[PDB]
Write a protein that binds this DNA or RNA. Structure first.
Ligand code: ZN
Ligand code: ZN
Lengths: 245, 195, 114, 91, 118, 120, 209, 96
DNA sequence: GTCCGCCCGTTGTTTCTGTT
DNA sequence: AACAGAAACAACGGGCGGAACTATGCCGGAC
RNA sequence: UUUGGCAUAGUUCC
């Protein structure tokens, strides 16, 4: 059709915990930047690039409507996991998502917007460079783009959940024993069986996860050591794995 | 410590930077988080490599990459990167010397070892995506020497090219006279022999 | 061609028609700021786009240890002998194997292609 | 080669060199100086909108397929009818 | 099926935009008949819409002026009238008629520059 | 993992009319022991036991302060030959005394007698 | 162009002549074999504003076994043939006392017109052929073996000889290109004669169903 | 030097790669033929190849003369690193 | 002893023309 | 204007090698 | 002279 044919390409962002896609200018405005000049300062670093400017123009043509942080936040939060019946709660949910689940590695404090905007602009800039044929697309098989989860990371990820469950159980016990108002004890509130049995089970079976949820748990970690020959033992102890089906 | 050194070494931060002084500056990423910009990338890289070789501020495990064309410096302190040691070639001569070799061959009753070799700045750990900015030589006394010039700017050297094989494939004799499926089959059958 | 911004709201200036003086005006959708442009051309689309990378080649590539070097191609400006060289290094190029050169003398940065 | 040309699809992008949209209300005083003579010759012997759609055709692709500007013009007329105007130079 | 759908959507869009540019009374330009001295073949023919007799007379003068310039270079009315009439007979629309006349004028001028009789 | 990650996981956990509040301070790890007494890896293999060490934590109880030290929260399996095993740093003669092979590389867990290996 | 339009009309006419000759109708050799220049001379070399106007090219021909059984080949001048056009053609057939007729279409027929063609099947038989489907003769393609329409007598004899019920023969759809070329209804049986690599010839049979 | 002219129906990269692969295949086949015709009447490879028992002239050629080109997915070895096959080569090296 | 990763055949939805 | 025949696009569901030999963990929880 | 099952991992052969 005529309008799609004239627009060509548009840039959209798939934020986590949001029902469907969002145009990028909406997210940038939700961060608190209103002026197209400022948004293009965050995205296009050198303004003497007319091809990049023309490429980003159709993305800015979706800003014809949205012009303010409040309405941008409303538009973002309209598509939550459970859409609200009110509007203030939806806007608070939108702000919470943009502060907690979008780019956690940049920051989670209150004043992290000035850096989240720069990093999101860098993502968009790299996308533009890829679309213009100025940088090579990445390949997933390159080994600089990989990490290896050894015993440290594996057991730490496993232990986080068990400590969280232990905290939940002691919290439940404390509340139940305190609503009576009589007293409260510590040793009786802690179930060591949680941690002990969880670690022992995950190491014994190989299903990396909780016992109740051994369906999506990735099986194949924690194999039983090969002892046919010394070379077999060594080559078993130095072994990798690609989770591809 | 890396962030502190970066601050000490005149690295302008993002919130203190006008969006006009970024076109001609090379962005700095630390653990994938953009922390600032710098205007002297070459001297910055020289200083960082010197500090890593001295083992003073930056541990030997940390990797540093400079993307010269795209003007980016990436420093990783992450866990899970895979790396292997390489010898260092300064101009065209290995920094490894006969004094190092003798002190190593007197290793007993001398408390001189691999750590004391690393601390001298002779060898180095290179991970996979730092290998993309390095020039390697397979054999010193064959590739550093004067020839019909192929490359005169070697940056590292291999210890021995036969260290590319695993545990089970290090027992095959003359694997370079074999066929690759045969080497794979022997790697499989080495775990089934009885001894 | 390029993007020009209003001085009041700092938004993109769209082209608007002045049906009285037969003139072109750039106006924004936030305020009533008007302007008169000198390009006189709203839109330009070149589909060949065989851009010469000499604009896009940085002079800092001369410090790359992984690039080949030659001494049979002296620099045009400073007459330095050694000069790094490489290929197009461009995606979306249908066909190209032409070489590009960069002088390795510091602060020269001459980037030509014979 | 003639049958090869007849049996291979080809739109205008395969032969066009560049295109642009101008604002030129004056039939005589044309923003582009190249078209002056023949555009004046066309207009001297006769409303309209002041906007333009100026395209440039690549010579190599134009002459490779043995195409002709009259053929392109008549194809445009067939495709859009007489609600467009078309004026073309020659080789 | 997608190309056919896009072509239909485009045709509807194009027709809508052109109807918004069509005024209520398209004045049908009145066909003025040829004068008694009109040298054109089939001068009263209305076969080409919006092509007037005065346009064809102008096109004929361009052919005469070009042929006159050519003959002066190489040391005419009948030939100009045949060239016009052939171009008229082959053309279906006024714009293509005009373009084919201007092409013949350019070909005559090329022959004159090459010192050749057209 | 044992040195840093468990401590970080404990610390980053959020703390949980009269009011009660708790805050876990720091952890501890003794060498592996058996409860019916250090437990050697060979005995763990022979008796179908699990080679593991107990993890303690300091928890502070406040009412609106009272400190509880060495709160036992469970047993953590120990990797062989690692810094927190009973074979760490021993010489070959001691290894032979404990009926452990001096050539054994280590780096595996003993879970219910069997020997487990984590795969990267 | 006028040359291309003349060429298309000539090719369509030639293919229809071949179709009628295959269907057993009586078409002479000179009608079968016309050069492009002969067709230009006989019925206009100028289509646009010329004598051939997709009319006067209609063909009326009588079957070799019955001059009373005749067929029409109509050329609608409309890109989309309509209900009223079909009614006009059926009226002409009724007045000329003609049972069967062919209709070559510029682009296509509306589904309403197609259903209004199907409805009168026992009264009249009309078939639709697109303009593109007749620029070539599919029968002449080397991938297509010879087809022969078999009489009810030949069918009965074949069934008795092999002791077959008609369910037990291979089938061919009534919308098949060759089936439409031969004008075969459901229940008729065609015979396929083709050379073979291991026998030298092999005769198959297909049931139209 | 841009003096290479493309072959019709092929890109510049395609024609360059075709010429290079053709030259290398000619070299491998010529060395193989030399190795074959330099055998002896007592050679056991020849005994097991001529009689059709097991082996082939290409196997004899790979044993004696040249193993030959290695291909991945039908093309030459790709550029796994940034514009080079291994860290031991300069960037943009198309030699054999 | 009680309670807790890719292909392609169906069917729908929606749309676009023809008849009376 | 109402109705009807045919078609473009979208969503859904089933389908994905053959044999054979070892081993190990587990088959519900609180009161 | 009588008969557990579910899951996961590894290996052999085309
Ligand atoms: Zn404004
Ligand atoms: Zn220079």
């Amino acid at each position: 059709g005529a309008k799609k044919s004239a627009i060509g390409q548009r840039i959209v962002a798939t934020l986590p915990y949001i029902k469907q896609e969002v145009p990028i200018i909406i997210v940038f405005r939700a961060l608190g930047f209103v002026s197209d000049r400022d948004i293009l300062e965050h995205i296009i670093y050198d303004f003497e690039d007319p091809e990049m400017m023309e490429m980003v123009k159709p993305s800015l043509d979706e800003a014809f409507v949205i012009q303010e942080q409040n309405v941008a936040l409303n538009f973002i939060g309209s598509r939550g996991a459970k859409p609200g019946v009110t509007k203030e709660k939806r806007i608070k949910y939108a702000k919470e998502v943009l502060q907690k689940e979008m780019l956690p590695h940049v920051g989670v404090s209150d004043f992290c917007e000035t850096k989240k905007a720069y990093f999101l602009g860098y993502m968009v800039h790299r996308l533009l460079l890829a679309a213009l044929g100025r940088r090579e697309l990445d390949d997933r098989d390159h080994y600089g783009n990989k990490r290896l989860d050894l015993a440290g990371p594996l057991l730490a990820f496993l232990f986080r959940g068990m400590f969280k469950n232990l905290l939940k159980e002691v919290r439940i016990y404390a509340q139940k024993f305190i609503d009576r108002g009589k007293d409260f004890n510590l040793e009786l509130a802690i179930k060591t069986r949680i941690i002990s049995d969880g670690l022992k089970y995950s190491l014994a079976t190989g299903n990396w996860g909780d016992q109740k949820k051994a369906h999506q748990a990735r099986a194949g970690v924690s194999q039983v050591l090969n002892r046919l020959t010394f070379a077999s033992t060594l080559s078993h102890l130095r072994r990798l794995n690609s989770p591809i089906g | 410590p890396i962030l502190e050194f970066l601050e000490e070494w005149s690295m302008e931060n993002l919130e203190e930077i006008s969006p006009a002084a970024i076109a001609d500056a090379t962005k700095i990423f630390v653990n994938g988080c953009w922390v600032g910009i710098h205007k002297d990338p070459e001297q910055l890289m020289n200083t960082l490599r010197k500090l890593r070789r001295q083992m003073d501020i930056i541990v030997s495990e940390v990797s540093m990459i400079r993307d010269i064309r795209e003007r980016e410096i990436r420093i990783y302190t992450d866990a899970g990167r895979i790396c292997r040691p390489l010898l260092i070639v300064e101009k065209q001569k290995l920094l490894l010397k006969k004094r190092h070799i003798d002190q190593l061959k007197e290793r007993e009753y001398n408390n001189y070892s691999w750590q004391d070799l690393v601390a001298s700045g002779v060898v180095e750990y290179i991970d996979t995506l730092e290998e993309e900015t390095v020039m390697l030589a397979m054999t010193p006394d064959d590739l550093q020497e004067k020839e019909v010039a192929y490359c005169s700017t070697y940056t590292h050297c291999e210890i021995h090219p036969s260290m590319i094989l695993g545990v089970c494939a290090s027992i095959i004799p003359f694997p370079d006279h074999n066929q690759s499926p045969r080497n794979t089959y022997q790697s499989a059958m080495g775990k089934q022999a009885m001894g | 061609v390029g993007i020009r911004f209003c001085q009041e709201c700092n938004n993109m200036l769209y082209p608007k028609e002045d049906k009285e003086n037969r003139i072109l005006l750039y106006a924004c959708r936030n305020c009533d700021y008007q302007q008169e442009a000198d390009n006189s051309c709203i839109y330009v689309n070149k589909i060949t786009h065989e851009v010469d990378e000499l604009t896009q080649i940085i002079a800092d590539v001369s410090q790359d240890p992984t690039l080949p070097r030659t001494e049979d191609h002296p620099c045009q400006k400073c007459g330095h002998k050694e000069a790094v060289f490489f290929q197009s290094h461009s995606a979306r190029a249908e066909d190209a194997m032409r070489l590009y050169y960069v002088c390795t003398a510091p602060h020269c940065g001459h980037r030509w292609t014979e | 080669k003639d049958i090869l040309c007849r049996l291979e699809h080809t739109t205008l992008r395969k032969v066009t060199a560049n295109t642009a949209i101008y604002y030129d209300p004056n039939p005589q005083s044309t923003v582009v100086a190249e078209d002056q003579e023949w555009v004046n010759v066309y207009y001297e012997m006769p409303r309209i909108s002041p906007w333009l759609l100026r395209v440039e055709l690549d010579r190599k692709h134009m002459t490779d397929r043995k195409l002709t500007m009259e053929q392109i013009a008549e194809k445009i007329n067939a495709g859009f009818g007489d609600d467009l105007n078309c004026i073309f130079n020659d080789d | 099926g997608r190309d056919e759908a896009h072509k239909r959507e485009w045709n509807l869009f194009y027709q809508k935009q052109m109807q918004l540019r069509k005024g209520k009374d398209p004045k049908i330009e009145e066909f003025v008949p040829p004068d008694e001295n009109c040298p054109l073949k089939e001068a009263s023919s209305r076969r080409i819409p919006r092509l007037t007799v005065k346009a064809r007379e102008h096109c004929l003068r361009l052919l005469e002026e070009a042929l006159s310039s050519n003959r002066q270079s190489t040391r005419l009315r009948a030939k100009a009238v045949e060239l016009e009439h052939e171009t008229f007979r082959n053309a279906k629309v006024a714009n293509l008629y005009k373009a084919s006349v201007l092409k013949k004028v350019a070909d005559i001028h090329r022959a004159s520059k090459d010192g050749q009789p057209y | 993992f044992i040195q840093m990650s468990v401590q970080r996981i404990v610390e980053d956990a959020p703390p949980i009319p009269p009011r009660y509040l708790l805050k876990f301070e720091q952890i501890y790890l003794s060498k592996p022991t058996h409860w019916e007494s250090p437990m050697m890896p060979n005995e763990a293999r022979l008796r179908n036991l699990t080679y593991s060490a107990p993890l303690y934590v300091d928890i502070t109880k406040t009412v609106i302060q009272t400190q509880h030290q060495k709160t036992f929260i469970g047993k953590i399996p120990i990797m062989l030959r690692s810094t927190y095993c009973l074979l760490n740093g021993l010489t070959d003669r001691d290894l032979c005394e404990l009926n452990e092979c001096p050539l054994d590389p280590g780096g595996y867990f003993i879970i219910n007698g069997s020997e487990k290996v984590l795969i990267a | 162009d006028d040359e291309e339009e003349t060429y298309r009309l000539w090719k369509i006419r030639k293919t229809i002549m071949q179709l009628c000759h295959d269907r057993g109708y009586l078409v002479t050799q000179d009608g079968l074999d016309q050069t492009l220049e002969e067709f230009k001379a006989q019925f206009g070399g100028k289509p646009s504003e010329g004598r051939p106007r997709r009319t006067d090219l209609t063909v009326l021909v009588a079957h070799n076994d019955d001059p009373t059984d005749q067929m029409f080949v109509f050329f609608p001048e409309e890109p989309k043939v309509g209900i009223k056009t079909i009614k006009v053609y059926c009226q002409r057939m009724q007045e000329e006392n003609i049972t069967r007729a062919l209709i070559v279409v510029q682009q296509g027929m509306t589904p309403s017109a197609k259903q209004s063609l199907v409805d009168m099947a026992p009264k009249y038989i009309l078939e639709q052929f697109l303009q593109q489907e007749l620029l070539i003769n599919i029968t002449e393609h080397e991938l297509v073996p010879e087809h022969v329409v078999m009489t009810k007598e030949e069918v009965t004899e074949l069934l008795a000889r092999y002791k077959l019920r008609e369910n037990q023969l291979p089938r061919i759809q009534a919308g098949d290109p060759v089936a439409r070329y031969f004008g075969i209804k459901r229940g008729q049986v065609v015979k396929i004669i083709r050379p073979s690599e291991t026998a030298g010839r092999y005769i198959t049979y297909r049931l139209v169903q | 030097n841009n003096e290479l002219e493309p072959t019709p129906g092929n890109t510049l990269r395609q024609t360059f790669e075709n010429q290079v692969n053709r030259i290398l295949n000619d070299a491998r086949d010529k060395t193989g033929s030399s190795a074959q015709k330099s055998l002896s009447e007592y050679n056991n490879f020849k005994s097991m190849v001529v009689s059709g028992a097991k082996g082939s002239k290409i196997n004899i050629s790979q044993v004696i003369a040249v193993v030959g080109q290695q291909n991945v997915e039908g093309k030459r070895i790709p550029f796994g690193f940034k514009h080079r096959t291994l860290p031991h080569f300069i960037k943009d090296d198309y030699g054999p």
